[PDB]
């Protein structure tokens, strides 16, 4: 199983290496900056007394951790090997899986929270407390641990043509458990989230569109337009950012694709797109949040 290491040669064109490096740098910087800024604004001004700010905080920390892995990944790309040893391999793999799932589970959570508010307003009174939002973040972290902790054990460095792969070792037979892992990641990080947010937001919109009021009404149309557009944006961003790397990982499980510049470049691009979700989340879920918006 080839993980961090791409079977490469012949060694790349100047322009493709500058491109890929620049890609990893920009995403890392923008991700770290946007998410630290959210954390700062929360800790300083808004304070975390509300459920929505507790979810925002959790999302930003996960997104900041996700992006924190990128410099390790640029060097690994630039050098064509993993130079950081076996301990850092475990730690970075682990952080990377944990926070992919935290990020994604928290953003699902925010969708479910909104569906609950509109479709179950009475239950929303019990669900939308700071206490529950903390319990939910712990539950999501538990769920994330089902993959985050095993990878900590499975991750290791090994030799692979003189060079060093930071990879996952699996029990026997490797071809079962390695493909199960890929499958699970694909369904819990992609399929299930896409279903959750599209169903929750689509049911939310449906309830909203069903409301009458003898007077209304142009105001109601107007509101629905703004909400619908926001739903379409957050879903479309999720899909554009995450679908490429997910599909690419499955395709590689199934067929053998010719090593080429296009293959190498597209792969890093798809990887960067994943981390771009973590860059856009602050915009989508903090800076455009009704209450958070108001500061400063």
């Amino acid at each position, epitope marked *: 199983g080839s993980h961090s290491l791409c079977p490469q040669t012949g060694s790349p064109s100047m322009v493709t290496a500058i491109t890929i490096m620049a890609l990893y740098s920009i995403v890392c910087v923008v991700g770290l900056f946007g998410n630290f800024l959210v954390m700062y604004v929360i800790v300083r001004y808004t304070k975390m*007394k*509300t459920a929505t700010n507790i979810y925002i905080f959790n999302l930003a920390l996960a997104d900041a951790l996700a992006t924190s892995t990128l410099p390790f990944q640029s060097v690994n790309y630039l050098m064509g090997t993993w130079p950081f040893g076996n301990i850092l391999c475990k730690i970075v793999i682990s952080i990377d899986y944990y926070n992919m799932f935290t990020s994604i589970f928290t953003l699902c959570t925010m969708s479910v929270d909104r569906y609950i508010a*509109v479709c179950h307003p009475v239950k*929303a*009174l*019990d669900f939308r*407390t700071p206490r529950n939002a903390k319990i939910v973040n712990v539950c999501n972290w538990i769920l994330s641990s089902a993959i985050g902790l095993p990878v900590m054990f499975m991750a290791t460095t090994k030799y692979r043509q003189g060079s060093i792969d930071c990879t996952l070792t699996f029990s026997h037979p490797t071809w079962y458990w390695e493909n199960l892992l890929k499958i699970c990641v694909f369904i819990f990080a992609f399929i299930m989230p896409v279903l959750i947010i599209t169903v929750c937001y689509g049911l939310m919109i449906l309830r909203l569109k069903s409301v009458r009021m003898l007077s209304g009404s142009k105001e109601k149309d107007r*509101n629905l337009r703004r*909400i619908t557009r926001m739903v379409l944006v957050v879903v479309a961003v999720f899909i554009v950012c995450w679908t490429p790397i997910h599909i690419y990982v499955i395709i590689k499980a199934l067929i053998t694709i010719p090593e080429t510049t296009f293959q190498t470049v597209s792969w890093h691009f798809c990887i960067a797109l994943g981390y771009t979700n973590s860059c856009l989340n602050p915009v989508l879920y903090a800076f455009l949040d*009704e209450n958070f918006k108001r500061c400063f």
Partner: nanobody
Amino acid sequence: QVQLVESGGGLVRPGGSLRLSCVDSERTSYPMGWFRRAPGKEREFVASITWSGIDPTYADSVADRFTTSRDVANNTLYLQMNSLKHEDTAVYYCAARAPVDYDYWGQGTQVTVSS
């Protein structure tokens, strides 16, 4: 014109819970806010919520304990008050917007926190 019916107030023990609700059944306005006035004090903001029911806003002194929701299908506003304290003893007023500050105010309900 508009007539806001507030329910669910009254007497609770310290640390207890109450659920207020408010409706304009005529669908002539949208109950969206809660204010209160303690004896001797000025009217203060408690909570509000957008039209859609998605986004609540809480006063700092109540954020940890109060939740608000809106039932957009029957135009009902709720306030769930937990862990009640002497500080929460007040007349609570529902506030509503016209479909076209707030435009309408309930006559209020007494919430009394006492042993």
